[PDB]
Amino acid sequence: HMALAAPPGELTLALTPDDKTLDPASLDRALAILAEHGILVLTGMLRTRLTDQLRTAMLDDLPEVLRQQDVPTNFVPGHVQQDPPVRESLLFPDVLLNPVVYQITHAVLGADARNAVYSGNMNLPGSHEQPVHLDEPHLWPGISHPPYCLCVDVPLIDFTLENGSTEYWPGSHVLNPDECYDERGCVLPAELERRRAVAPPVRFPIPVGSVVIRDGRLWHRGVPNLSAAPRPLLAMTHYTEWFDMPPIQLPDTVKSWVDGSDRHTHAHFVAGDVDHLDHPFAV
């Protein structure tokens, strides 16, 4: 792997939280980066007011998560599946219904594209190396097809090479040779080494306030958090209208602003509070 000191210029668009919309040139560069590299880093998108509250809420919940009988874990120890709270006080339009994110996902997936994931990845101190995998598979084996899902990753602290910044395989989102992927979405080692010689993977720091948009088929892995603090990531995934997904459970206290929107959510609205803490998204 290549270990960098900052998000690479070729993958990165610098914004402020005042940027409500990408100008045509910025939008074209964003789509060109997603098409070629399968991953786009957008710095300076979210106010620290929002990331502070989500960070606090997830670190506060983590004891109750680790106290459960069977801790939902992705592939290897230390990579915990943890939903952020879905209390009305912690559901922010600028996170769920971000105008820049939906401008990008509308242009790639269509105006009918919808968020169907409001989850998270808590990377614990002493975590192991995940196998390289994709989060969502190609729809047929041996076939080239365009994207149908875009993962939207929101770091809730500064990500470093020390504390488990995700490893990404740029351009891997279009690879779909026969016999490449097992039932867990893990990449066959023979294909890993072939690809490594043409386009090796990258790990880079990502400052909090950033949003990472990537093809859901991009090869990546969680890596060891060698720090003394848990590394929280909030995770969302936009899908085409026609991809079967269970709905996100949300309280009907947010139905007024979620259900109205031209930024679609596959949501089921519940009277009272949802129990956000046996997870369907843990592999």
Ligand X SMILES: O=C(O)CNC(=O)C(=O)O
Q: Using CB under 6 A as the criterion, which residues of the chain lie in contact with ligand XXX when the complex forms?
A: 74, 81, 117, 119, 121, 135-136, 151, 235, 237, 281, 283
Q: How many CB atoms lie within 10 A of CB 262?
A: 8
**Rounded distance, CA 146 to CA 189, Å?**
24
| Residue choice 61, 83, 135, 136 for contact with Ni ion (CB under 5 A) | 135
User: Does 280 help bind a second copy (rule: CB under 8 A)?
Assistant: no
User: What is the residue type of 266?
Assistant: H
| Residue choice 51, 98, 105, 123 for contact with ligand X (CB under 6 A) | 123
Annotate each residue in 199-238 with x if it binds ligand X (CB under 6 A) or - if it does not, as one string. ---------------------x-x----------x-----
Residues 6+ apart with CB under 8 A from 135: 151, 185, 216, 217, 220, 237
**Rounded distance, CA 79 to CA 82, Å?**
9
Instruction: Check: CB of residue 253 under 8 Å from CB of residue 173.
Output: no
**Residue matched to tokens 């929101």:** 154
User: Which tokens go with 27?
Assistant: 């939008």
User: Does 260 help bind a second copy (rule: CB under 8 A)?
Assistant: no
Q: Cα 148 from chain centroid?
A: 15
Partner whose binding site includes residue 143, from ligand XXX, a second copy, Ni ion, none (CB under 5 to 8 Å by kind): a second copy
Q: How far is the CB of 34 from Ni ion (least distance, A)?
A: 17
Which of positions 112-151 make contact with a second copy (CB under 8 A)? 139-140, 143, 145-146, 148
Residues that bind a second copy (CB under 8 A): 139-140, 143, 145-146, 148, 240-245
